[PDB]
C-alpha cells in the first residue's frame, strides 16, 4: 500500500533520499549486467565465482524423462505403509506376514540407505537400489527385487 511507503515520508525533503551530490541519474554503470569483466568485476568475483566461461559437454535435445529416478531412503521406507498397518507391524501383531512395498507405485525408482531399519522382514520392489540399502534390507530380514 502507498501509505506505508517511504516516499510519503520523503515529501517536503528535496532529492527524496537520493542525495544531493549523487542525484539518482538514469543508468550510471550501465544497464543489466554491463561491465561484468570490467567496473562490475569486483562484485562479479566476490559473489558468483564462476560466472564466466564454459564447463562440460553439451547434450542436444535433452529429454528430462530419461533421467527420472526419484529416490527414497530406508529411514522413510516405513512411512510408505499405511499408519494403522505400520503400527501393527512395529508393535508386532503380525510376525507371520511381510509387507510388499511398490516404490514405483509410490512414485520412486531408487532405494537409498540413509537411515536405520527395524528388525522386521519387508519386501521392496524397486527399479534401482543402492548397495547399502540392499545390505540394510537383507540384515533387517527382507529382500529387494528389481521390477523395472
Amino acid at each position: 500500500p502507498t501509505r506505508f511507503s517511504k516516499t510519503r515520508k520523503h515529501r517536503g525533503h528535496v532529492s527524496a533520499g537520493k542525495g544531493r551530490v549523487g542525484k539518482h541519474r538514469k543508468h550510471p554503470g550501465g544497464r543489466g549486467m554491463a561491465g561484468g569483466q570490467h567496473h562490475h568485476r569486483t562484485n562479479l568475483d566476490k559473489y558468483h565465482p564462476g560466472y564466466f566461461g564454459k564447463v562440460g559437454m553439451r547434450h542436444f535435445h535433452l529429454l528430462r524423462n530419461h533421467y527420472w529416478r526419484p529416490s527414497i531412503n530406508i529411514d522413510k521406507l516405513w512411512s510408505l505403509v499405511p499408519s494403522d498397518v505400520r503400527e501393527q507391524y512395529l508393535s508386532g501383531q503380525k510376525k507371520d506376514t511381510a509387507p510388499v512395498i511398490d516404490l514405483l507405485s509410490h512414485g520412486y525408482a531408487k532405494l537409498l540407505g540413509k537411515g536405520r531399519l527395524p528388525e522386521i522382514p519387508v519386501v521392496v520392489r524397486a527399479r534401482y537400489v543402492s548397495a547399502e540399502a540392499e545390505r540394510k534390507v537383507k540384515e533387517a530380514g527382507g529382500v529387494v527385487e528389481l521390477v523395472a
Partner: protein
Amino acid sequence: AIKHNQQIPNNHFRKHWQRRVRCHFDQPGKKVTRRLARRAKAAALAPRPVDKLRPIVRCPTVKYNRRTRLGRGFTLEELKAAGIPRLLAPTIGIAVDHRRKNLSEESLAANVQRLKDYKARLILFPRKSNKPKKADTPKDQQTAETTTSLRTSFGVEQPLAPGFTEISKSEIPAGIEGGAYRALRKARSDARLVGVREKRAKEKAEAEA
C-alpha cells in the same frame, strides 16, 4: 548494475512486453459461458451421455510408465474382439482410433472387457418406434437409471498399481544370487560391452583362416 549479493537478474522484458499482456478478468465469465455450452449440448444429447467411451492407455515414457489414463479411441482389433462393428461404434458413443495398435494381450484384453461392459450397459432405442429390430432394446428394459458422464462412470479405476501388499513369511522370494545391486552392475556392464565382445569373438573365430 549489480550492487550486492543478488541472484543475477534475467527478466525477459527487453522487448515491448506490454504490447502482449494477457490478463484474465474474463475467467469467471468464461466459466459461465462454458457451463452454458455444456448444459446446451447435454440437452441436445437428451438421453445420451455427454461424452464418448474412451479406452485405458498406458502413458509412454519411463516417467509415467507406471500410470494409466484415458486414450483417444478403441482400436479396430479391440472393436472386432468385442464384436462391435467399426461403422456402428462411433454412432453409439464409442470413440475409435484407427492408428493405435495392441502390442500386448494385457491392454487388448482390458479394452475388450471395457467395451463388453459398455455394450452390456447400452440401451439402444429403435430407429422407428413402431417397428423395432432385433438389435434394439425391446421397450421393456428401456427404462433404467442412466448415466450422462462416461468419464466418471467409466473412468480409470486405478491408474497406479497398489503400493502396499501383504504376503505371509516363508513366501518371501529369494533374492537375486549376487544381489540386486550387483545384478544391475552386471546388466549395465553387459550392455556396455555387447559390441566389443561380439567383434572380439568374431575376430578370434576367423583368426584360424
